[PDB]
Amino acid sequence: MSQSNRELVVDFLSYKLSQKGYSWSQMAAVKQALREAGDEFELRYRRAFSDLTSQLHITPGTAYQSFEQVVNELFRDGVNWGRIVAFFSFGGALCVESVDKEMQVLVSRIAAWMATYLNDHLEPWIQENGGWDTFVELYGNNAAAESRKG
């Protein structure tokens, strides 16, 4: 339990630091900025277009086909930070739809597909466009939501 206990402590402290605008580490800052960006993306998307999850239609036999058809079109002509947030939000919605349909078995698979796509097809762009540090500079401190509300 030693390492699970350290993990629980770190998660809790990271959360409480984030609530006051602080961070446990650079990685925690990235995670937080991405959480906040996803929340805001999904808010904008559902007000304009529909709840994303409600639009998704998955079964274990075609789950990757569903994922790939969307992700390949999203990035067909290139990458930018807004599309990277969209990618995360889509994967989140696909996982929620899967569990809605009693198919939590698909969640691990989706996470793997996302990590692989990030590594193979997004990271090369990220590492030439300022890296995750730039993502935090641009989206951290709930920046996207703050701009809209302004």
Binding site: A37, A48, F49, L56, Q69, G82, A143
Partner: peptide
């Protein structure tokens, strides 16, 4: 490709230095 075009709606108009 409904979903992806209208992710690219929000994502391009979420995209941020310029």
């Amino acid at each position: 490709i409904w979903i992806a075009q209208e992710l690219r709606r929000i994502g391009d108009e979420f995209n941020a230095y310029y």
